[PDB]
Design a protein around this ligand. Sequence first.
Ligand SMILES: COc1ccc(-c2nc3cc(F)ccc3n2[C@H](C(=O)N[C@H]2CC[C@H](C(=O)O)CC2)C2CCCCC2)c(OC)n1
Lengths: 11, 229
Amino acid sequence: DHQLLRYLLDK
Amino acid sequence: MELTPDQQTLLHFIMDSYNKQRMPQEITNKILKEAFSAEENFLILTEMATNHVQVLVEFTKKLPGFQTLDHEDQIALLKGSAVEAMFLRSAEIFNKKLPSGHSDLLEARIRNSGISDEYITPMFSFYKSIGELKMTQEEYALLTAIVILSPDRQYIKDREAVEKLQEPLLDVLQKLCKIHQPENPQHFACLLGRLTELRTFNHHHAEMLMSWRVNDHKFTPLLCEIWDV
Ligand SMILES: COc1ccc(-c2nc3cc(F)ccc3n2[C@H](C(=O)N[C@H]2CC[C@H](C(=O)O)CC2)C2CCCCC2)c(OC)n1
């Protein structure tokens, strides 16, 4: 689900 | 023929964002200082690869128009280019001029780092191929940006939106190629050709880490997401 990558992109 | 003020603005902005990377001299000095075990080199690699991903996300967020793209396509571009961009950055560091006999020692240290011999020859073939091009800092920065904004990446929903962002970067790169090497009109094509050689490293990246000559292959949660380990 790429949670850390999604987090690094969104905030 | 020559760069327009808008293109020069795009160029200096790409150069500033790109310079936020780790110093090439810092990385090569550590490798050349002393020989490390395959275990120490594996730990160095995972740390360097974790930092590279973090710096890459920041560089990518600053790429003009990137934040306007669909959030799912944003993740697919990052996942699709992360490994390629790290190898392109290693090739850049590999080909930086050093004192007599240092690049021979750098090569020998990388050959004996712990990586499987199966991957040594394709890796140095790419690094030497990149070096023969005598690329400037701006060419490395633009080629990295072009690698990230590849529309023909897997799982991309809106390829046309990605194409729109890559095209002005390709135009600037082509103009720089015609300026920095007017005697070599094949130079721009040669750079784009080297990008297809890059893509062939993406196929066995997970194996390159798993086949490292260590007993335990421990990775950070962020590395597990980007490299498929
Ligand atoms: C997965 O297999 C491998 C194997 C070897 C490398 C490699 N090629 C290098 C060429 C150089 F000229 C210098 C370093 C180089 N590396 C390693 C590194 O750490 N490369 C970073 C250096 C920092 C850079 C950045 O973030 O600016 C981002 C690539 C070190 C790891 C420790 C043993 C020796 C090789 C690699 O690079 C992706 N992948």
